[PDB]
């Protein structure tokens, strides 16, 4: 029946699809969660702790991570430490479009808890449904997303009612696993949510044009980065986005339901496509599950390898930026002309290693573009790091060939208590990146 949001009642009709939906050390990398942070990461990722203190650091919740259910318990404390209100629940839980189109600007100023509270107490934690992808009259597949995903489609100059079936196949998936911003108003509560795709195409979501977008909205100001007291937006998980840039798979014709729900019918199962002896591979590929897996992991490796380059690059400059200050604060001159474009420089660079570093395919949907973004980060970063190297110089502070990035100082004080960076280890790459801890 039309409105109907159990899927048990779905359940009878479609039971193998039911069964499949409900049902929920490695040798693969993953990047980190941009909006869950967690001090297991910053571990991995050093220069994580110093770029990303004043977003929010928080323990990792080891639980199962499918469709079918999802505990409130944790997205209710992130949510009301960020006033978010009722943006968090956008992409978990069947109930957002109804919500959204009920309380207009209130879903977003509207505290969580009191969001979460309308929802009925039997689907409180109900993730996704099959009515967020599936059509209850003929189980063609639909946009539940109007409010963000059909709003974006508009941005790209897409007319929805010419997608095709295929077209459909990744989209469907791009109403949730896609970058979004917050733009806030002036008490700092929540006044909407939007993909950041403006100046973007069917085929070509580039971080030019994302990037773009944010340092051009002064709404989406988010937060404040501590190292440098700068206002900044954020990127999340930008799969569709990364995926669907002219990618090897996406010009070979496949979805993403291809490689995370092959056929046998379509596995509802959000299983990894590397499971079950790379069964999702062989339908198109020749090579051995053994040949794959290695490629996979080479694939990995080098973005993980471009995504400390980068970052590191990034950290230098970030902690430059807090020695023109302190030096600034001394009575010292910083040249202006230097630091505006240091700056600007900057802001290209933190984006595109949020960008690749925020999706957890660790480059894999798209492992050229992965290179591309963050070959491009380390140039920016480099060139802001050479005019705020001069700029000091020219105030009388000499910044040394190696870096001290003081990592520990930007622990919160949980997370000194878990972890601890040794002062002693020094990074020195092949390329000139030079920092100690
Ligand atoms: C919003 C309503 C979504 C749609 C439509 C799709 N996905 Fe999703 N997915 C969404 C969330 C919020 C989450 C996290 C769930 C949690 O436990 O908090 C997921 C998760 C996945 C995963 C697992 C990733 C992980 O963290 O291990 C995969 C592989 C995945 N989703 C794939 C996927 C595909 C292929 C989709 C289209 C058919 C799709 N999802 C749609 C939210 C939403
Ligand atoms: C849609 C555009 C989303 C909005 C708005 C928010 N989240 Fe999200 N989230 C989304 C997806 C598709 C996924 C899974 C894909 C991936 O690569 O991770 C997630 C995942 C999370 C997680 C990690 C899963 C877990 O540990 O349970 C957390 C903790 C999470 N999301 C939190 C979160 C918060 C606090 C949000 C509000 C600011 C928020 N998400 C919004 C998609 C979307
Ligand atoms: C989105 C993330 C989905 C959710 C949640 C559910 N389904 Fe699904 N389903 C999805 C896709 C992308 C496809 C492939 C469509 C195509 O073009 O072939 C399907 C397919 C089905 C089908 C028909 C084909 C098949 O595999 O048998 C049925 C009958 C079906 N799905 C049922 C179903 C039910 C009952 C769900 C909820 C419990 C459900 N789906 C969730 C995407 C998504
Ligand atoms: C095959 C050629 C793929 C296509 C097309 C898409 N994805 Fe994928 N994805 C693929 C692999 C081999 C991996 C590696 C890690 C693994 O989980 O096996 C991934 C990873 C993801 C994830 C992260 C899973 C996690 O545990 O956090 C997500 C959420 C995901 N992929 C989503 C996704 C979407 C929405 C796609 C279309 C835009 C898409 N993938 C295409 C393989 C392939
Ligand atoms: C078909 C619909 C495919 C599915 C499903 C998967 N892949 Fe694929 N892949 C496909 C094509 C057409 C190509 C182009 C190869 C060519 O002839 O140029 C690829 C390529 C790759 C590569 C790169 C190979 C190289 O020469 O460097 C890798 C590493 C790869 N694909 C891996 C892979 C994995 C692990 C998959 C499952 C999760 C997978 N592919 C599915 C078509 C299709």
Same mark, same amino acid.
């Given at each position: 029946?039309?409105?109907?949001?159990?899927?048990?009642?779905?359940?009878?009709?479609?039971?193998?699809?039911?069964?499949?939906?409900?049902?929920?050390?490695?040798?693969?990398?993953?990047?980190?969660?941009?909006?869950?942070?967690?001090?297991?990461?910053?571990?991995?990722?050093?220069?994580?702790?110093?770029?990303?203190?004043?977003?929010?650091?928080?323990?990792?919740?080891?639980?199962?991570?499918?469709?079918?259910?999802?505990?409130?318990?944790?997205?209710?404390?992130?949510?009301?430490?960020?006033?978010?209100?009722?943006?968090?629940?956008?992409?978990?839980?069947?109930?957002?479009?109804?919500?959204?189109?009920?309380?207009?600007?209130?879903?977003?100023?509207?505290?969580?808890?009191?969001?979460?509270?309308?929802?009925?107490?039997?689907?409180?934690?109900?993730?996704?449904?099959?009515?967020?992808?599936?059509?209850?009259?003929?189980?063609?597949?639909?946009?539940?997303?109007?409010?963000?995903?059909?709003?974006?489609?508009?941005?790209?100059?897409?007319?929805?009612?010419?997608?095709?079936?295929?077209?459909?196949?990744?989209?469907?998936?791009?109403?949730?696993?896609?970058?979004?911003?917050?733009?806030?108003?002036?008490?700092?509560?929540?006044?909407?949510?939007?993909?950041?795709?403006?100046?973007?195409?069917?085929?070509?979501?580039?971080?030019?044009?994302?990037?773009?977008?944010?340092?051009?909205?002064?709404?989406?100001?988010?937060?404040?980065?501590?190292?440098?007291?700068?206002?900044?937006?954020?990127?999340?998980?930008?799969?569709?986005?990364?995926?669907?840039?002219?990618?090897?798979?996406?010009?070979?014709?496949?979805?993403?339901?291809?490689?995370?729900?092959?056929?046998?019918?379509?596995?509802?199962?959000?299983?990894?496509?590397?499971?079950?002896?790379?069964?999702?591979?062989?339908?198109?590929?020749?090579?051995?599950?053994?040949?794959?897996?290695?490629?996979?992991?080479?694939?990995?490796?080098?973005?993980?390898?471009? &995504?400390?380059?980068? #970052?590191? @690059? =990034? /950290?230098?400059?970030? *902690?430059?930026?807090?020695?023109?200050?302190? +030096?600034? $604060?001394?009575?010292?001159?910083?040249?202006?002309?230097?630091?505006?474009?240091?700056?600007?420089?900057?802001?290209?660079?933190?984006?595109?290693?949020?960008?690749?570093?925020?999706?957890?395919?660790?480059?894999?949907?798209?492992?050229?573009?992965? &290179?591309?973004?963050? #070959?491009? @980060? =380390? /140039?920016?970063?480099? *060139?802001?790091?050479?005019?705020?190297?001069? +700029?000091? $110089?020219?105030?009388?502070?000499?910044?040394?060939?190696?870096?001290?990035?003081?990592?520990?100082?930007?622990?919160?004080?949980?997370?000194?208590?878990?972890?601890?960076?040794?002062?002693?280890?020094?990074?020195?790459?092949?390329?000139?990146?030079?920092?100690?801890?």
């Amino acid at each position: 029946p039309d409105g109907e949001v159990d899927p048990a009642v779905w359940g009878k009709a479609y039971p193998t699809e039911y069964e499949m939906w409900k049902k929920t050390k490695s040798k693969y990398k993953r990047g980190f969660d941009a909006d869950h942070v967690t001090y297991d990461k910053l571990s991995e990722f050093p220069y994580m702790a110093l770029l990303f203190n004043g977003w929010g650091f928080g323990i990792a919740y080891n639980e199962p991570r499918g469709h079918a259910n999802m505990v409130r318990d944790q997205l209710e404390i992130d949510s009301a430490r960020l006033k978010s209100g009722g943006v968090c629940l956008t992409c978990k839980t069947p109930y957002a479009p109804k919500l959204e189109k009920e309380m207009g600007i209130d879903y977003f100023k509207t505290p969580f808890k009191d969001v979460l509270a309308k929802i009925p107490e039997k689907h409180k934690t109900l993730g996704v449904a099959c009515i967020d992808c599936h059509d209850n009259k003929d189980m063609s597949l639909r946009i539940s997303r109007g409010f963000t995903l059909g709003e974006a489609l508009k941005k790209l100059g897409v007319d929805q009612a010419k997608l095709s079936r295929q077209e459909m196949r990744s989209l469907v998936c791009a109403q949730c696993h896609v970058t979004y911003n917050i733009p806030k108003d002036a008490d700092k509560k929540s006044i909407g949510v939007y993909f950041p795709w403006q100046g973007s195409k069917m085929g070509n979501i580039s971080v030019e044009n994302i990037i773009k977008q944010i340092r051009s909205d002064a709404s989406v100001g988010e937060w404040t980065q501590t190292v440098t007291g700068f206002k900044l937006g954020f990127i999340r998980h930008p799969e569709y986005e990364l995926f669907s840039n002219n990618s090897v798979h996406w010009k070979a014709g496949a979805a993403c339901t291809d490689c995370h729900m092959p056929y046998t019918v379509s596995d509802h199962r959000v299983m990894s496509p590397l499971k079950n002896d790379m069964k999702a591979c062989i339908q198109c590929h020749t090579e051995k599950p053994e040949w794959l897996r290695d490629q996979v992991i080479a694939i990995q490796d080098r973005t993980v390898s471009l &995504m400390l380059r980068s #970052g590191y @690059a =990034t /950290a230098t400059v970030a *902690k430059l930026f807090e020695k023109a200050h302190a +030096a600034q $604060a001394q009575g010292k001159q910083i040249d202006k002309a230097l630091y505006d474009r240091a700056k600007d420089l900057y802001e290209e660079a933190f984006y595109r290693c949020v960008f690749i570093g925020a999706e957890n395919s660790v480059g894999f949907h798209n492992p050229t573009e992965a &290179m591309r973004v963050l #070959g491009d @980060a =380390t /140039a920016f970063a480099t *060139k802001a790091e050479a005019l705020l190297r001069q +700029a000091l $110089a020219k105030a009388g502070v000499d910044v040394p060939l190696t870096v001290n990035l003081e990592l520990n100082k930007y622990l919160d004080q949980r997370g000194e208590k878990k972890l601890t960076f040794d002062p002693k280890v020094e990074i020195k790459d092949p390329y000139g990146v030079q920092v100690r801890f």
